[PDB]
Amino acid sequence: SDTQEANDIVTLANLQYNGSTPADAFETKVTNIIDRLNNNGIHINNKVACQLIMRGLSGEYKFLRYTRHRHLNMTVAELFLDIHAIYEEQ
Amino acid sequence: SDTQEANDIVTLANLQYNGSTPADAFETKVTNIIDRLNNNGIHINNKVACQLIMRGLSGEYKFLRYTRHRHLNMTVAELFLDIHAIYEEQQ
C-alpha cells in the first residue's frame, strides 16, 4: 500500500522470535520484508539485516548474537539455517 | 561504528515526541539519522521518513498524522516547521 515501506521498517526494527512461530513463517516473513524494502529502493544488506534479526532473537536463540561476531560476511540464509537447526530440536 | 545503521533504523522506527524535548533537538536527531542512513547507502525518502516521524507523534502533535493525508509530497522540513510552530506556542 501507500504505507508499506514504513510498516516493513517498523516490523524489521521490532522483530521478536523465541521459537513460538514456525521458523518457515519467521524466515519468509523477514525475507519478504527485505525484498519489498529492496524493490522500493531501501537497501538493507546482509550485515544490517542479520544485526536486526539477531537483536530481539531471545530464549534458546539468544546465543546466535554472541557467536555472530566471528560471523562477518554472514548472509540472512546462513543465519536462518541456524534458527531452523535450533527449532527442529524442540 | 559497525552497528550504526541497525541502531539508526531502530531509533527511527520507535520515535516518540509529545513536546517535552525542544523541537530543535528532535529535528537534528531525526535529520542526522536520515543523513547517516543515506551515507551508508540506505535512502529513506520524504514520504517514508514523514510516515515514521508522524507515527509516535503524540499529545498536541497527534493531529499532524490526520491532516498528513491531504499532505502528499510533504517534505521532512515542511513537517518540522509544523512541529516547531506548535512547540513555540506550548512555550
Numbering used by the authors:
A (entry chain A): 261 to 350
B (entry chain B): 261 to 351
Quote the original article.
Excessive replication of Saccharomyces cerevisiae Ty1 retrotransposons is regulated by Copy Number Control, a process requiring the p22/p18 protein produced from a sub-genomic transcript initiated within Ty1 GAG. To minimize genomic damage, p22/p18 interrupts virus-like particle function by interaction with Gag. Thus, p22 is identical to the C-terminal half of Gag-p49 and is processed at the C-terminus by PR to generate a mature protein p18, that is identical to the C-terminal half of mature capsid Gag-p4525,27. The structure comprises an all α-helical domain related to that observed in the CA-CTD of the yeast Ty3 retrotransposon, ARC proteins, and orthoretroviruses.
We determined the crystal structures of p18mAUG1 and p18mAUG2 expressed in E. coli. The p18mAUG1 structure was solved by molecular replacement using the p18mAUG2 structure as a search model. Both constructs crystallised in the same P6522 hexagonal spacegroup with the p18mAUG1 crystals diffracting to a slightly higher resolution of 2.8 Å and the structure refined to an R-factor and Free R-factor of 25.6 and 26.4% respectively. In both structures, the asymmetric unit (ASU) comprises three copies of the p18m monomer. The structure has an all-helical fold making a five-helix bundle (α1-α5) comprising α1 (residues E265-A273), α2 (residues D284-N300), α3 residues (N306-M314), α4 (residues Y321-R330) and α5 (residues V336-Q351). In all copies, residues spanning D262 to Q351 are visible in the electron density map. There is no additional density for residues 249 to 259 that constitute the additional N-terminal sequence difference between AUG1 and AUG2. Quantitative mobility assays revealed that a fragment containing AUG1 to residue 355 of p18 retained potent restriction of Ty1, comparable to full-length p18. In the first (Dimer-1), the exposed surfaces of α1 and α3 pack against α1’ and α3’ of the opposing monomer. In the second interface (Dimer-2), residues on the outer surface of α4 and α5 pack against α4′ and α5′ of the opposing monomer.
